[PDB]
Enzyme design. Sequence first.
Site, PDB file in Angstrom:
ATOM      1  NE  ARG A 123     -10.771  -6.110   5.856  1.00 34.13           N
ATOM      2  CZ  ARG A 123      -9.416  -6.026   5.532  1.00 34.13           C
ATOM      3  NH1 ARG A 123      -9.120  -5.076   4.057  1.00 34.13           N
ATOM      4  NH2 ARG A 123      -8.573  -6.436   6.238  1.00 34.13           N
TER       5      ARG A 123
ATOM      6  CD  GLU B  99      -6.982  -7.348  -5.109  1.00 38.27           C
ATOM      7  OE1 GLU B  99      -7.028  -8.138  -3.651  1.00 38.27           O
ATOM      8  OE2 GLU B  99      -6.272  -6.064  -5.025  1.00 38.27           O
TER       9      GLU B  99
ATOM     10  NE  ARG C 197      -7.983 -10.141   2.859  1.00 36.45           N
ATOM     11  CZ  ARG C 197      -7.430  -9.236   2.818  1.00 36.45           C
ATOM     12  NH1 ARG C 197      -6.726  -8.633   1.851  1.00 36.45           N
ATOM     13  NH2 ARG C 197      -7.687  -8.534   3.954  1.00 36.45           N
TER      14      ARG C 197
ATOM     15  CE1 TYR D  73      -8.847  -6.176   0.012  1.00 40.40           C
ATOM     16  CE2 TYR D  73      -9.450  -4.046  -0.886  1.00 40.40           C
ATOM     17  CZ  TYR D  73      -8.930  -4.958   0.053  1.00 40.40           C
ATOM     18  OH  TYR D  73      -8.426  -4.315   1.511  1.00 40.40           O
TER      19      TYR D  73
ATOM     20  CG  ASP E 189      -1.938  -1.040   1.242  1.00 45.10           C
ATOM     21  OD1 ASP E 189      -2.409  -1.788   0.554  1.00 45.10           O
ATOM     22  OD2 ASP E 189      -2.787  -0.961   2.366  1.00 45.10           O
TER      23      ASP E 189
END
Length: 379
Positions: free
Chosen positions: A243, A358, A306, A339, A59
């Site tokens: 979330r 993603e 994820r 995501y 990030d």
Amino acid sequence: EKSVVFKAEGEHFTDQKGNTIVGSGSGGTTKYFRIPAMCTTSKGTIVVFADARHNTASDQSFIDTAAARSTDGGKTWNKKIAIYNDRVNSKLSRVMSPTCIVANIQGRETILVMVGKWNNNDKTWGAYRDKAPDTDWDLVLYKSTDDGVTFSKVETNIHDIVTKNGTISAMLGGVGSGLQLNDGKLVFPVQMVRTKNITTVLNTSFIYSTDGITWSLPSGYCEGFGSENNIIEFNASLVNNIRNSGLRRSFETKDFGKTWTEFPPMDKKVDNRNHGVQGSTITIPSGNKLVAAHSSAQNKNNDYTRSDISLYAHNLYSGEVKLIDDFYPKVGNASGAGYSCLSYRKNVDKETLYVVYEANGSIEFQDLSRHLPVIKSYN
């Protein structure tokens, strides 16, 4: 059916002068893509935004907002940079984390895209709570009125309304898509980092506008959880889908953002397991009823990988939930995974349901329209 929108270590962008952007992917390509956001226009055109994280998945890195446009149903893509970072800091300057809306703004079909902007901050945004707002932060808005071919900055009062509030260090869109209400109002879900003196670090809310230029914040706040969120319109409620580590949260406001209460048909209905993940939540008509379509990760490894990015239907009347399609049934890259963004449209008599997501540093697209009869029947 999948197409690759943005290929990790496979894209070359140019800057404002037309010079190549030499990233850290092999051959000087952009290293990694994150945080996809999409819409479909009345022309059938698909526009996908994502962070072009030229050097690394972090990030806190050098990032521009890329845009891909498809006029052939997602088979092929024309790509460019829609929003350039300020180029203060070759390591840290960034525009990131898009939220988009396609809307009719006083008759004019417009694509809006909103991203956060930083330059010298070397930490995550939750680290900067001393100022109202942080001097390194901004939240910028760009538009297209030519069907996604060109984007230009919109001059707004968004920074001013944050300053006037006085209790917000930084604000970001909720990630993925916002909405246009039945009455025409434009709404972006938002996430905010509160100033240090506020007991809660994060909150959720929205900003709203008639013209896309002058925006407003409502007086209330919703609890933050993991703060990434989307809003749907359901009768005279706005309903969010947030979330959270473990079970996702969903609240409704019946007073246009003064107060929020749990929304039973979606609250705690989907489990994203440890840390949580961003998810996309939209409505799809079925007669004069509505169904919510939702995408987020099953996270079978209970960690940052994820896995298994999946499409769910929520029955907004009964509260039943079911899995429609595990469209990315793979373990993600823990450098940044999971995501997604959905887009539903009926143009004439042609209904489309698309997703972007993603995939190991790339952004992929799928046409999920074959699932529409199953989703619509969930009323």
